[PDB]
Subunit: 328 residues, 2 copies
Protein backbone atom coordinates (compact mmCIF):
# COMPACT_ATOMS: atom_id res chain seq x y z
CA UNK A 1 0.00 0.00 0.00
CA UNK A 2 1.36 3.42 -1.12
CA UNK A 3 1.73 6.53 1.13
CA UNK A 4 -1.21 8.95 1.27
CA UNK A 5 0.67 12.24 1.42
CA UNK A 6 -1.26 15.44 2.21
CA UNK A 7 -1.23 19.14 1.31
CA UNK A 8 -1.00 20.15 4.96
CA UNK A 9 2.76 20.76 5.15
CA UNK A 10 2.79 22.68 1.84
CA UNK A 11 -0.13 24.92 2.91
CA UNK A 12 1.46 25.66 6.28
CA UNK A 13 4.92 26.42 4.84
CA UNK A 14 3.35 28.65 2.16
CA UNK A 15 0.86 30.48 4.46
CA UNK A 16 2.82 33.75 4.61
CA UNK A 17 3.32 33.79 0.83
CA UNK A 18 -0.25 32.79 0.02
CA UNK A 19 -1.66 35.70 1.98
CA UNK A 20 0.25 37.90 -0.48
CA UNK A 21 -1.01 35.83 -3.45
CA UNK A 22 -4.63 36.00 -2.23
CA UNK A 23 -4.33 39.76 -1.76
CA UNK A 24 -3.24 40.04 -5.44
CA UNK A 25 -6.08 37.78 -6.53
CA UNK A 26 -8.80 39.82 -4.79
CA UNK A 27 -7.19 43.02 -6.05
CA UNK A 28 -6.91 42.09 -9.74
CA UNK A 29 -10.35 40.59 -9.98
CA UNK A 30 -11.70 44.16 -9.50
CA UNK A 31 -13.23 46.14 -12.40
CA UNK A 32 -15.64 49.07 -12.86
CA UNK A 33 -17.64 46.71 -15.09
CA UNK A 34 -19.59 45.06 -12.24
CA UNK A 35 -20.32 41.62 -13.82
CA UNK A 36 -16.56 40.92 -13.97
CA UNK A 37 -15.80 40.79 -10.18
CA UNK A 38 -19.26 39.24 -9.53
CA UNK A 39 -18.68 36.30 -11.96
CA UNK A 40 -15.01 35.95 -10.94
CA UNK A 41 -15.59 35.88 -7.16
CA UNK A 42 -18.44 33.40 -7.63
CA UNK A 43 -15.76 30.95 -8.89
CA UNK A 44 -12.65 32.04 -6.97
CA UNK A 45 -14.30 32.42 -3.52
CA UNK A 46 -16.19 29.10 -4.05
CA UNK A 47 -13.08 27.14 -3.06
CA UNK A 48 -10.26 25.42 -4.88
CA UNK A 49 -7.10 23.76 -3.62
CA UNK A 50 -4.75 26.46 -4.97
CA UNK A 51 -2.19 23.76 -5.85
CA UNK A 52 -0.91 25.71 -8.81
CA UNK A 53 0.04 28.95 -6.95
CA UNK A 54 1.25 26.76 -4.05
CA UNK A 55 3.65 25.04 -6.43
CA UNK A 56 4.94 28.40 -7.71
CA UNK A 57 5.48 29.40 -4.06
CA UNK A 58 7.13 26.04 -3.19
CA UNK A 59 9.39 26.16 -6.26
CA UNK A 60 10.53 29.71 -5.54
CA UNK A 61 11.41 28.97 -1.90
CA UNK A 62 13.06 25.61 -2.76
CA UNK A 63 15.15 27.43 -5.38
CA UNK A 64 16.01 30.01 -2.67
CA UNK A 65 14.32 33.25 -3.78
CA UNK A 66 15.45 36.44 -2.00
CA UNK A 67 12.36 38.53 -2.70
CA UNK A 68 8.63 37.84 -2.96
CA UNK A 69 8.04 38.85 -6.58
CA UNK A 70 7.14 35.24 -7.38
CA UNK A 71 3.79 35.97 -5.64
CA UNK A 72 2.57 37.89 -8.70
CA UNK A 73 3.46 34.86 -10.88
CA UNK A 74 1.62 32.61 -8.43
CA UNK A 75 -1.39 34.90 -8.68
CA UNK A 76 -1.13 34.95 -12.53
CA UNK A 77 -1.05 31.12 -12.54
CA UNK A 78 -4.30 30.93 -10.53
CA UNK A 79 -5.95 33.42 -12.88
CA UNK A 80 -4.87 31.33 -15.86
CA UNK A 81 -6.26 28.25 -14.13
CA UNK A 82 -9.51 30.09 -13.23
CA UNK A 83 -9.97 31.29 -16.79
CA UNK A 84 -9.46 27.78 -18.20
CA UNK A 85 -12.15 26.53 -15.79
CA UNK A 86 -14.68 29.09 -17.04
CA UNK A 87 -13.91 28.20 -20.64
CA UNK A 88 -13.72 24.45 -20.08
CA UNK A 89 -17.03 24.35 -18.15
CA UNK A 90 -18.74 26.22 -21.01
CA UNK A 91 -17.23 23.85 -23.61
CA UNK A 92 -18.05 20.66 -21.69
CA UNK A 93 -21.51 21.86 -20.56
CA UNK A 94 -20.76 21.08 -16.86
CA UNK A 95 -23.39 22.21 -14.33
CA UNK A 96 -21.36 22.19 -11.11
CA UNK A 97 -17.94 23.61 -10.18
CA UNK A 98 -16.45 23.87 -6.68
CA UNK A 99 -19.84 23.06 -5.12
CA UNK A 100 -21.64 25.99 -6.81
CA UNK A 101 -23.62 26.19 -10.06
CA UNK A 102 -21.27 26.79 -13.01
CA UNK A 103 -21.01 30.56 -13.69
CA UNK A 104 -22.31 30.28 -17.27
CA UNK A 105 -25.69 29.05 -15.99
CA UNK A 106 -26.11 32.30 -14.02
CA UNK A 107 -24.46 34.91 -16.27
CA UNK A 108 -24.53 33.07 -19.60
CA UNK A 109 -21.90 31.37 -21.77
CA UNK A 110 -20.76 34.59 -23.44
CA UNK A 111 -20.05 36.38 -20.15
CA UNK A 112 -18.20 33.31 -18.79
CA UNK A 113 -15.99 33.32 -21.86
CA UNK A 114 -15.39 37.09 -21.66
CA UNK A 115 -14.58 37.12 -17.91
CA UNK A 116 -12.16 34.28 -18.61
CA UNK A 117 -10.58 36.55 -21.27
CA UNK A 118 -10.35 39.32 -18.59
CA UNK A 119 -8.59 36.99 -16.11
CA UNK A 120 -6.22 35.77 -18.78
CA UNK A 121 -5.26 39.36 -19.55
CA UNK A 122 -4.97 40.19 -15.82
CA UNK A 123 -2.61 37.24 -15.43
CA UNK A 124 -0.27 38.74 -18.11
CA UNK A 125 -0.47 42.20 -16.67
CA UNK A 126 0.74 40.66 -13.37
CA UNK A 127 3.59 38.86 -15.06
CA UNK A 128 4.65 42.04 -16.81
CA UNK A 129 5.00 43.69 -13.37
CA UNK A 130 7.57 41.09 -12.26
CA UNK A 131 9.80 42.02 -15.25
CA UNK A 132 10.72 38.38 -15.75
CA UNK A 133 10.68 37.79 -19.45
CA UNK A 134 11.56 34.13 -18.96
CA UNK A 135 8.67 33.56 -16.55
CA UNK A 136 6.37 35.29 -19.03
CA UNK A 137 7.53 33.05 -21.93
CA UNK A 138 6.99 29.99 -19.74
CA UNK A 139 3.36 30.87 -18.95
CA UNK A 140 2.51 32.20 -22.43
CA UNK A 141 3.72 28.88 -23.81
CA UNK A 142 1.76 26.95 -21.14
CA UNK A 143 -1.42 28.83 -22.01
CA UNK A 144 -1.04 28.06 -25.72
CA UNK A 145 -0.40 24.40 -24.97
CA UNK A 146 -3.53 24.20 -22.80
CA UNK A 147 -5.64 25.46 -25.72
CA UNK A 148 -4.00 22.93 -28.07
CA UNK A 149 -4.69 20.12 -25.64
CA UNK A 150 -8.32 21.18 -25.32
CA UNK A 151 -8.76 21.34 -29.09
CA UNK A 152 -7.03 17.93 -29.41
CA UNK A 153 -9.45 16.56 -26.85
CA UNK A 154 -12.43 18.18 -28.66
CA UNK A 155 -11.33 16.56 -31.95
CA UNK A 156 -10.10 13.18 -30.74
CA UNK A 157 -11.51 12.25 -27.33
CA UNK A 158 -15.03 11.71 -28.66
CA UNK A 159 -14.54 8.27 -30.25
CA UNK A 160 -13.72 4.88 -28.67
CA UNK A 161 -10.71 4.26 -30.90
CA UNK A 162 -8.67 6.79 -28.95
CA UNK A 163 -5.21 5.44 -28.17
CA UNK A 164 -3.51 5.69 -24.78
CA UNK A 165 -0.70 7.70 -26.43
CA UNK A 166 -3.05 10.40 -27.78
CA UNK A 167 -4.81 10.39 -24.39
CA UNK A 168 -1.48 10.98 -22.58
CA UNK A 169 -0.60 13.68 -25.10
CA UNK A 170 -3.92 15.40 -24.33
CA UNK A 171 -3.57 15.26 -20.53
CA UNK A 172 0.05 16.41 -20.73
CA UNK A 173 -0.99 19.50 -22.70
CA UNK A 174 -4.29 20.40 -21.11
CA UNK A 175 -3.34 19.71 -17.47
CA UNK A 176 0.26 18.76 -16.77
CA UNK A 177 1.82 21.76 -18.58
CA UNK A 178 0.30 24.41 -16.25
CA UNK A 179 1.73 22.46 -13.26
CA UNK A 180 5.12 22.26 -14.98
CA UNK A 181 4.91 26.02 -15.81
CA UNK A 182 3.87 26.96 -12.25
CA UNK A 183 6.94 25.24 -10.79
CA UNK A 184 9.30 26.31 -13.53
CA UNK A 185 8.13 29.96 -13.36
CA UNK A 186 8.55 29.83 -9.54
CA UNK A 187 12.11 28.56 -10.01
CA UNK A 188 13.16 31.13 -12.63
CA UNK A 189 11.91 34.03 -10.40
CA UNK A 190 14.56 32.99 -7.86
CA UNK A 191 17.26 33.63 -10.48
CA UNK A 192 18.74 30.14 -10.46
CA UNK A 193 20.63 27.84 -12.74
CA UNK A 194 18.84 25.93 -15.47
CA UNK A 195 19.42 22.61 -13.69
CA UNK A 196 17.19 23.67 -10.79
CA UNK A 197 14.42 25.13 -12.98
CA UNK A 198 14.52 22.06 -15.23
CA UNK A 199 14.30 19.79 -12.17
CA UNK A 200 11.32 21.71 -10.81
CA UNK A 201 9.68 21.76 -14.21
CA UNK A 202 10.16 17.96 -14.31
CA UNK A 203 8.50 17.73 -10.86
CA UNK A 204 5.46 19.75 -11.94
CA UNK A 205 4.99 17.96 -15.31
CA UNK A 206 5.00 14.53 -13.68
CA UNK A 207 2.84 15.80 -10.78
CA UNK A 208 0.30 17.05 -13.32
CA UNK A 209 0.11 13.75 -15.22
CA UNK A 210 -0.52 11.90 -11.91
CA UNK A 211 -3.00 14.63 -10.98
CA UNK A 212 -5.03 14.33 -14.18
CA UNK A 213 -5.03 10.50 -14.16
CA UNK A 214 -6.40 10.64 -10.59
CA UNK A 215 -8.93 13.28 -11.71
CA UNK A 216 -10.05 11.03 -14.57
CA UNK A 217 -10.42 8.08 -12.15
CA UNK A 218 -12.31 10.33 -9.68
CA UNK A 219 -14.79 11.15 -12.45
CA UNK A 220 -16.08 7.57 -12.25
CA UNK A 221 -15.24 6.66 -8.65
CA UNK A 222 -15.77 9.91 -6.71
CA UNK A 223 -18.82 11.46 -5.06
CA UNK A 224 -20.25 14.71 -6.39
CA UNK A 225 -20.47 16.12 -2.88
CA UNK A 226 -16.75 15.70 -2.14
CA UNK A 227 -15.59 16.49 -5.74
CA UNK A 228 -17.62 19.73 -5.99
CA UNK A 229 -18.43 18.80 -9.58
CA UNK A 230 -20.64 16.08 -11.11
CA UNK A 231 -19.23 12.56 -11.18
CA UNK A 232 -19.85 11.21 -14.69
CA UNK A 233 -19.33 14.42 -16.69
CA UNK A 234 -16.80 12.62 -18.99
CA UNK A 235 -19.17 9.69 -19.55
CA UNK A 236 -22.20 11.93 -20.18
CA UNK A 237 -20.11 14.14 -22.57
CA UNK A 238 -19.09 11.00 -24.49
CA UNK A 239 -15.50 11.78 -23.56
CA UNK A 240 -13.10 8.85 -23.62
CA UNK A 241 -10.51 8.87 -20.89
CA UNK A 242 -8.11 6.14 -19.83
CA UNK A 243 -10.38 4.46 -17.20
CA UNK A 244 -12.99 3.95 -19.95
CA UNK A 245 -10.40 2.85 -22.52
CA UNK A 246 -8.85 0.32 -20.14
CA UNK A 247 -12.28 -1.02 -19.10
CA UNK A 248 -13.30 -1.46 -22.75
CA UNK A 249 -10.06 -3.45 -23.20
CA UNK A 250 -10.84 -5.83 -20.29
CA UNK A 251 -14.58 -6.11 -21.16
CA UNK A 252 -14.28 -8.62 -24.01
CA UNK A 253 -16.66 -8.90 -26.99
CA UNK A 254 -19.88 -8.88 -24.94
CA UNK A 255 -19.97 -5.15 -24.02
CA UNK A 256 -18.92 -3.59 -27.36
CA UNK A 257 -22.45 -2.51 -28.44
CA UNK A 258 -23.08 -0.83 -25.05
CA UNK A 259 -20.08 1.51 -25.41
CA UNK A 260 -20.88 2.09 -29.12
CA UNK A 261 -24.38 3.30 -28.22
CA UNK A 262 -23.41 5.29 -25.11
CA UNK A 263 -20.17 6.88 -26.38
CA UNK A 264 -19.82 6.55 -30.18
CA UNK A 265 -23.42 7.45 -31.01
CA UNK A 266 -23.79 9.03 -27.53
CA UNK A 267 -27.33 7.75 -26.76
CA UNK A 268 -27.86 7.77 -22.99
CA UNK A 269 -29.86 7.69 -19.77
CA UNK A 270 -28.71 7.96 -16.15
CA UNK A 271 -28.73 4.14 -15.93
CA UNK A 272 -25.94 3.95 -18.54
CA UNK A 273 -23.59 5.80 -16.14
CA UNK A 274 -24.24 3.41 -13.23
CA UNK A 275 -23.53 0.48 -15.58
CA UNK A 276 -20.28 2.14 -16.78
CA UNK A 277 -19.10 3.03 -13.23
CA UNK A 278 -19.52 -0.62 -12.17
CA UNK A 279 -17.67 -1.96 -15.25
CA UNK A 280 -14.79 0.49 -14.65
CA UNK A 281 -14.33 -0.40 -10.93
CA UNK A 282 -14.88 -4.15 -11.32
CA UNK A 283 -12.60 -4.64 -14.32
CA UNK A 284 -9.78 -3.07 -12.24
CA UNK A 285 -9.61 -0.23 -14.77
CA UNK A 286 -9.87 2.39 -12.04
CA UNK A 287 -7.01 0.66 -10.18
CA UNK A 288 -4.77 0.44 -13.26
CA UNK A 289 -5.28 4.21 -13.90
CA UNK A 290 -4.15 4.97 -10.34
CA UNK A 291 -1.17 2.57 -10.73
CA UNK A 292 -0.07 4.70 -13.67
CA UNK A 293 -0.76 7.88 -11.66
CA UNK A 294 1.46 6.53 -8.84
CA UNK A 295 4.20 5.88 -11.46
CA UNK A 296 4.07 9.55 -12.45
CA UNK A 297 4.05 10.56 -8.76
CA UNK A 298 7.29 8.54 -8.24
CA UNK A 299 8.81 10.36 -11.21
CA UNK A 300 7.75 13.71 -9.63
CA UNK A 301 9.40 12.78 -6.32
CA UNK A 302 12.57 11.56 -8.08
CA UNK A 303 12.70 14.82 -10.09
CA UNK A 304 13.61 16.66 -6.82
CA UNK A 305 16.64 14.44 -5.98
CA UNK A 306 19.19 17.27 -6.52
CA UNK A 307 17.54 19.42 -3.84
CA UNK A 308 18.42 19.33 -0.11
CA UNK A 309 16.07 17.13 1.90
CA UNK A 310 14.37 20.07 3.68
CA UNK A 311 10.73 20.85 4.62
CA UNK A 312 9.88 22.39 1.24
CA UNK A 313 11.16 19.28 -0.53
CA UNK A 314 9.21 16.96 1.82
CA UNK A 315 6.06 19.07 1.30
CA UNK A 316 6.41 18.60 -2.48
CA UNK A 317 6.92 14.87 -2.07
CA UNK A 318 3.82 14.65 0.10
CA UNK A 319 1.89 16.59 -2.57
CA UNK A 320 2.95 14.04 -5.21
CA UNK A 321 1.37 11.23 -3.15
CA UNK A 322 -1.62 13.43 -2.46
CA UNK A 323 -2.18 13.96 -6.20
CA UNK A 324 -2.81 10.18 -6.48
CA UNK A 325 -4.52 9.52 -3.09
CA UNK A 326 -6.96 12.52 -2.94
CA UNK A 327 -10.76 12.28 -3.06
CA UNK A 328 -11.22 15.80 -4.49
CA UNK B 1 -12.26 65.38 -48.56
CA UNK B 2 -11.99 61.66 -49.26
CA UNK B 3 -8.60 60.14 -48.49
CA UNK B 4 -7.99 56.43 -48.95
CA UNK B 5 -7.06 53.21 -47.24
CA UNK B 6 -5.16 52.26 -50.42
CA UNK B 7 -2.24 54.67 -50.03
CA UNK B 8 -1.01 53.12 -46.73
CA UNK B 9 -1.63 49.55 -48.00
CA UNK B 10 0.76 50.18 -50.93
CA UNK B 11 3.38 51.85 -48.67
CA UNK B 12 3.27 48.98 -46.20
CA UNK B 13 3.71 46.23 -48.88
CA UNK B 14 7.28 45.03 -48.09
CA UNK B 15 6.54 45.10 -44.36
CA UNK B 16 3.16 43.36 -44.57
CA UNK B 17 4.63 40.39 -46.45
CA UNK B 18 6.91 39.64 -43.48
CA UNK B 19 3.93 40.17 -41.12
CA UNK B 20 1.75 37.78 -43.13
CA UNK B 21 4.52 35.16 -43.17
CA UNK B 22 4.74 35.45 -39.32
CA UNK B 23 0.93 35.28 -39.17
CA UNK B 24 0.91 32.07 -41.27
CA UNK B 25 3.82 30.47 -39.44
CA UNK B 26 2.70 31.18 -35.86
CA UNK B 27 -0.90 30.01 -36.38
CA UNK B 28 0.44 26.51 -37.14
CA UNK B 29 0.02 23.63 -34.71
CA UNK B 30 0.47 19.84 -34.63
CA UNK B 31 -3.27 19.98 -33.88
CA UNK B 32 -4.54 20.33 -37.44
CA UNK B 33 -7.90 22.04 -37.00
CA UNK B 34 -6.32 25.05 -35.24
CA UNK B 35 -4.61 26.52 -38.34
CA UNK B 36 -7.56 25.36 -40.50
CA UNK B 37 -10.06 27.35 -38.39
CA UNK B 38 -7.74 30.34 -37.90
CA UNK B 39 -6.96 30.80 -41.63
CA UNK B 40 -10.72 31.00 -42.36
CA UNK B 41 -10.95 34.21 -40.32
CA UNK B 42 -7.51 35.57 -41.07
CA UNK B 43 -7.02 35.20 -44.88
CA UNK B 44 -10.72 36.01 -45.48
CA UNK B 45 -10.58 39.37 -43.67
CA UNK B 46 -8.58 41.14 -46.37
CA UNK B 47 -7.97 44.62 -44.92
CA UNK B 48 -5.53 44.04 -41.95
CA UNK B 49 -6.03 47.56 -40.52
CA UNK B 50 -4.86 46.84 -37.00
CA UNK B 51 -1.42 45.38 -38.02
CA UNK B 52 -1.08 48.26 -40.48
CA UNK B 53 -1.31 50.63 -37.45
CA UNK B 54 1.73 48.92 -35.93
CA UNK B 55 3.69 48.94 -39.22
CA UNK B 56 2.79 52.57 -39.97
CA UNK B 57 3.52 53.78 -36.42
CA UNK B 58 6.91 52.04 -36.29
CA UNK B 59 7.83 53.39 -39.71
CA UNK B 60 6.74 57.00 -38.94
CA UNK B 61 8.68 56.78 -35.67
CA UNK B 62 11.73 55.66 -37.69
CA UNK B 63 12.32 52.05 -36.55
CA UNK B 64 15.78 50.70 -37.33
CA UNK B 65 14.79 47.16 -36.26
CA UNK B 66 12.45 44.35 -37.34
CA UNK B 67 10.60 43.79 -34.06
CA UNK B 68 7.42 45.61 -35.07
CA UNK B 69 6.54 42.86 -37.53
CA UNK B 70 6.11 40.37 -34.72
CA UNK B 71 4.01 42.89 -32.78
CA UNK B 72 1.94 43.54 -35.91
CA UNK B 73 1.26 39.81 -36.26
CA UNK B 74 0.46 39.55 -32.52
CA UNK B 75 -2.06 42.41 -32.91
CA UNK B 76 -3.86 40.45 -35.65
CA UNK B 77 -3.94 37.35 -33.38
CA UNK B 78 -5.52 39.38 -30.57
CA UNK B 79 -8.02 40.91 -33.01
CA UNK B 80 -8.94 37.47 -34.39
CA UNK B 81 -9.19 35.97 -30.91
CA UNK B 82 -11.67 38.68 -29.87
CA UNK B 83 -13.77 38.04 -33.01
CA UNK B 84 -13.79 34.30 -32.27
CA UNK B 85 -15.09 34.96 -28.75
CA UNK B 86 -17.89 37.23 -30.04
CA UNK B 87 -19.91 34.82 -32.19
CA UNK B 88 -20.32 32.42 -29.25
CA UNK B 89 -24.00 32.91 -28.14
CA UNK B 90 -28.97 33.67 -20.16
CA UNK B 91 -27.72 31.86 -23.28
CA UNK B 92 -26.15 28.87 -21.48
CA UNK B 93 -24.92 26.41 -24.14
CA UNK B 94 -22.70 27.18 -27.15
CA UNK B 95 -24.00 27.38 -30.70
CA UNK B 96 -22.57 24.83 -33.14
CA UNK B 97 -18.90 25.60 -33.79
CA UNK B 98 -18.92 27.62 -30.53
CA UNK B 99 -16.60 25.20 -28.71
CA UNK B 100 -13.85 25.37 -31.35
CA UNK B 101 -14.20 29.18 -31.51
CA UNK B 102 -13.64 29.51 -27.74
CA UNK B 103 -10.53 27.33 -27.78
CA UNK B 104 -8.97 28.56 -31.04
CA UNK B 105 -9.52 32.05 -29.58
CA UNK B 106 -7.58 30.95 -26.47
CA UNK B 107 -4.80 29.53 -28.65
CA UNK B 108 -4.42 32.77 -30.67
CA UNK B 109 -4.52 35.00 -27.55
CA UNK B 110 -1.67 32.92 -26.09
CA UNK B 111 0.26 32.74 -29.40
CA UNK B 112 0.13 36.54 -29.60
CA UNK B 113 1.91 36.81 -26.28
CA UNK B 114 4.50 34.17 -27.25
CA UNK B 115 5.12 36.20 -30.42
CA UNK B 116 5.59 39.33 -28.32
CA UNK B 117 8.06 37.53 -25.99
CA UNK B 118 10.20 36.88 -29.07
CA UNK B 119 10.73 40.67 -29.49
CA UNK B 120 12.08 40.95 -25.92
CA UNK B 121 10.11 44.19 -25.64
CA UNK B 122 8.61 44.34 -22.14
CA UNK B 123 7.01 47.71 -22.87
CA UNK B 124 5.20 46.32 -25.91
CA UNK B 125 3.90 43.34 -23.91
CA UNK B 126 2.72 45.71 -21.18
CA UNK B 127 0.84 47.83 -23.72
CA UNK B 128 -0.87 44.82 -25.33
CA UNK B 129 -1.63 43.02 -22.05
CA UNK B 130 -3.36 46.16 -20.78
CA UNK B 131 -5.15 46.54 -24.16
CA UNK B 132 -6.41 42.96 -23.90
CA UNK B 133 -7.71 43.63 -20.41
CA UNK B 134 -9.49 46.85 -21.44
CA UNK B 135 -10.99 45.12 -24.53
CA UNK B 136 -12.38 42.36 -22.36
CA UNK B 137 -13.88 44.98 -19.98
CA UNK B 138 -15.33 46.79 -23.00
CA UNK B 139 -16.90 43.60 -24.32
CA UNK B 140 -18.38 42.61 -20.94
CA UNK B 141 -19.83 46.16 -20.58
CA UNK B 142 -21.38 46.06 -24.07
CA UNK B 143 -23.11 42.81 -23.26
CA UNK B 144 -24.55 44.01 -19.92
CA UNK B 145 -25.77 47.07 -21.92
CA UNK B 146 -26.84 45.18 -25.07
CA UNK B 147 -30.50 45.49 -24.05
CA UNK B 148 -30.25 49.08 -22.87
CA UNK B 149 -32.80 51.65 -24.00
CA UNK B 150 -31.46 54.53 -21.92
CA UNK B 151 -27.72 54.31 -22.58
CA UNK B 152 -26.06 57.72 -22.53
CA UNK B 153 -23.73 59.01 -25.25
CA UNK B 154 -20.83 59.09 -22.77
CA UNK B 155 -21.16 55.40 -21.69
CA UNK B 156 -21.55 54.26 -25.31
CA UNK B 157 -18.33 56.13 -26.17
CA UNK B 158 -16.61 54.42 -23.23
CA UNK B 159 -17.81 51.03 -24.61
CA UNK B 160 -16.51 51.58 -28.12
CA UNK B 161 -13.29 53.14 -26.85
CA UNK B 162 -12.57 49.98 -24.89
CA UNK B 163 -13.81 47.36 -27.38
CA UNK B 164 -12.77 48.93 -30.70
CA UNK B 165 -10.42 51.90 -30.39
CA UNK B 166 -8.12 50.53 -27.68
CA UNK B 167 -6.62 47.89 -30.00
CA UNK B 168 -5.96 50.56 -32.64
CA UNK B 169 -4.32 52.75 -30.00
CA UNK B 170 -2.30 49.84 -28.57
CA UNK B 171 -1.20 48.67 -32.03
CA UNK B 172 0.07 52.21 -32.78
CA UNK B 173 1.66 52.74 -29.39
CA UNK B 174 3.38 49.31 -29.56
CA UNK B 175 4.64 50.05 -33.06
CA UNK B 176 6.07 53.36 -31.78
CA UNK B 177 7.84 51.88 -28.73
CA UNK B 178 9.46 49.15 -30.86
CA UNK B 179 11.04 52.05 -32.81
CA UNK B 180 12.63 53.24 -29.56
CA UNK B 181 11.21 56.76 -29.62
CA UNK B 182 10.46 59.00 -26.65
CA UNK B 183 7.22 59.02 -24.67
CA UNK B 184 5.93 62.14 -26.51
CA UNK B 185 6.18 60.31 -29.84
CA UNK B 186 4.54 57.05 -28.64
CA UNK B 187 1.80 59.05 -26.89
CA UNK B 188 0.94 60.98 -30.05
CA UNK B 189 0.80 57.78 -32.10
CA UNK B 190 -1.31 56.13 -29.41
CA UNK B 191 -3.69 59.13 -29.69
CA UNK B 192 -3.81 58.80 -33.46
CA UNK B 193 -4.84 55.15 -33.13
CA UNK B 194 -7.43 55.82 -30.42
CA UNK B 195 -9.09 58.65 -32.35
CA UNK B 196 -8.92 56.69 -35.63
CA UNK B 197 -10.64 53.72 -33.91
CA UNK B 198 -13.45 55.94 -32.64
CA UNK B 199 -13.86 57.52 -36.08
CA UNK B 200 -14.13 54.12 -37.78
CA UNK B 201 -16.70 52.82 -35.31
CA UNK B 202 -18.97 55.86 -35.29
CA UNK B 203 -19.05 56.09 -39.09
CA UNK B 204 -19.74 52.36 -39.20
CA UNK B 205 -22.64 53.02 -36.79
CA UNK B 206 -23.82 55.65 -39.31
CA UNK B 207 -23.16 53.53 -42.44
CA UNK B 208 -25.74 51.10 -41.01
CA UNK B 209 -28.55 53.62 -41.66
CA UNK B 210 -27.98 49.29 -30.08
CA UNK B 211 -25.62 51.96 -31.54
CA UNK B 212 -25.31 55.80 -31.26
CA UNK B 213 -27.91 56.91 -33.91
CA UNK B 214 -30.71 54.84 -32.31
CA UNK B 215 -29.61 55.85 -28.81
CA UNK B 216 -29.74 59.54 -29.72
CA UNK B 217 -33.08 59.26 -31.58
CA UNK B 218 -34.75 57.57 -28.61
CA UNK B 219 -33.31 60.26 -26.29
CA UNK B 220 -34.75 62.89 -28.67
CA UNK B 221 -38.11 61.13 -29.17
CA UNK B 222 -39.22 61.94 -25.61
CA UNK B 223 -39.62 59.92 -22.34
CA UNK B 224 -40.89 56.36 -21.73
CA UNK B 225 -43.52 56.09 -24.52
CA UNK B 226 -41.09 56.02 -27.45
CA UNK B 227 -38.22 54.85 -25.19
CA UNK B 228 -39.66 51.66 -23.66
CA UNK B 229 -42.07 51.33 -26.62
CA UNK B 230 -39.17 51.04 -29.09
CA UNK B 231 -37.35 48.81 -26.57
CA UNK B 232 -40.33 46.43 -26.41
CA UNK B 233 -40.19 46.17 -30.22
CA UNK B 234 -36.37 45.82 -30.24
CA UNK B 235 -39.17 43.50 -37.05
CA UNK B 236 -38.15 44.17 -40.70
CA UNK B 237 -41.54 45.84 -41.17
CA UNK B 238 -40.87 47.60 -37.85
CA UNK B 239 -37.44 48.85 -39.11
CA UNK B 240 -37.98 52.03 -41.19
CA UNK B 241 -40.16 53.55 -38.41
CA UNK B 242 -37.13 54.00 -36.11
CA UNK B 243 -34.97 55.16 -39.06
CA UNK B 244 -37.41 58.07 -39.54
CA UNK B 245 -36.91 58.87 -35.83
CA UNK B 246 -33.12 58.65 -36.40
CA UNK B 247 -32.79 61.09 -39.34
CA UNK B 248 -35.73 63.36 -38.40
CA UNK B 249 -34.43 64.17 -34.91
CA UNK B 250 -30.93 64.97 -36.27
CA UNK B 251 -29.38 61.90 -34.63
CA UNK B 252 -27.79 60.42 -37.77
CA UNK B 253 -26.20 63.80 -38.45
CA UNK B 254 -24.91 64.05 -34.89
CA UNK B 255 -23.20 60.64 -35.34
CA UNK B 256 -21.46 61.52 -38.62
CA UNK B 257 -20.13 64.82 -37.30
CA UNK B 258 -18.80 63.26 -34.06
CA UNK B 259 -17.13 60.63 -36.27
CA UNK B 260 -15.45 63.50 -38.21
CA UNK B 261 -14.34 65.27 -35.01
CA UNK B 262 -12.58 62.04 -34.01
CA UNK B 263 -10.93 61.85 -37.44
CA UNK B 264 -9.60 65.42 -37.13
CA UNK B 265 -8.22 64.63 -33.67
CA UNK B 266 -6.39 61.62 -35.20
CA UNK B 267 -4.85 63.86 -37.84
CA UNK B 268 -3.95 66.56 -35.36
CA UNK B 269 -2.06 63.95 -33.22
CA UNK B 270 0.46 63.42 -36.04
CA UNK B 271 1.58 67.04 -36.26
CA UNK B 272 4.96 66.43 -34.51
CA UNK B 273 6.08 63.97 -37.21
CA UNK B 274 7.76 64.87 -40.56
CA UNK B 275 5.26 65.52 -43.37
CA UNK B 276 6.24 62.34 -45.25
CA UNK B 277 4.50 59.51 -47.09
CA UNK B 278 3.78 57.62 -43.83
CA UNK B 279 2.18 60.72 -42.21
CA UNK B 280 0.12 61.58 -45.29
CA UNK B 281 -1.00 57.96 -45.63
CA UNK B 282 -2.18 58.09 -41.97
CA UNK B 283 -3.90 61.45 -42.60
CA UNK B 284 -5.64 59.96 -45.66
CA UNK B 285 -6.74 56.95 -43.55
CA UNK B 286 -8.42 59.21 -41.02
CA UNK B 287 -10.45 60.83 -43.82
CA UNK B 288 -11.25 57.37 -45.22
CA UNK B 289 -12.70 56.34 -41.85
CA UNK B 290 -15.33 59.06 -42.44
CA UNK B 291 -15.89 58.97 -46.24
CA UNK B 292 -16.15 55.22 -47.20
C1 LIG C 1 -7.46 20.20 -15.06
C2 LIG C 1 -8.32 20.08 -13.84
C3 LIG C 1 -8.60 18.73 -13.23
C4 LIG C 1 -8.83 21.21 -13.35
C5 LIG C 1 -9.61 21.25 -12.09
O1 LIG C 1 -8.49 21.57 -11.25
P1 LIG C 1 -8.38 21.36 -9.67
O2 LIG C 1 -8.80 19.95 -9.36
O3 LIG C 1 -7.02 21.77 -9.16
O4 LIG C 1 -9.54 22.41 -9.25
P2 LIG C 1 -9.60 23.44 -8.00
O5 LIG C 1 -8.77 24.64 -8.40
O6 LIG C 1 -11.09 23.70 -8.05
O7 LIG C 1 -9.10 22.76 -6.76
C1 LIG D 1 -9.77 23.40 -17.06
C2 LIG D 1 -9.17 22.16 -17.63
C3 LIG D 1 -7.79 22.22 -18.20
C4 LIG D 1 -9.92 21.05 -17.60
C5 LIG D 1 -9.43 19.74 -18.14
O1 LIG D 1 -9.77 18.62 -17.32
P1 LIG D 1 -11.27 18.12 -16.96
O2 LIG D 1 -12.29 18.52 -17.99
O3 LIG D 1 -11.08 16.67 -16.60
O4 LIG D 1 -11.48 18.97 -15.60
P2 LIG D 1 -12.83 19.06 -14.72
O5 LIG D 1 -13.22 17.63 -14.41
O6 LIG D 1 -12.28 19.85 -13.57
O7 LIG D 1 -13.88 19.75 -15.56
CA1 LIG E 1 -14.28 19.65 -17.82
CA1 LIG F 1 -12.37 15.65 -14.86
Amino acid sequence: PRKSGSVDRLVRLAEADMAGVNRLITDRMQSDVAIIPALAEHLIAAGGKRLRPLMTVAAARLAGADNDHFQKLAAAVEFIHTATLLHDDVVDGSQLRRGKVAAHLIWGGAQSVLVGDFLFARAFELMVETNSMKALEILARASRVIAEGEVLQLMRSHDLNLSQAVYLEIIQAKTAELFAAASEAGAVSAGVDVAKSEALRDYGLNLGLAFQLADDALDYGGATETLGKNAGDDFREGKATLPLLLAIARSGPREAEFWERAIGRREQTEADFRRARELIIGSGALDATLDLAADYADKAKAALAMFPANDWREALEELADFAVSRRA
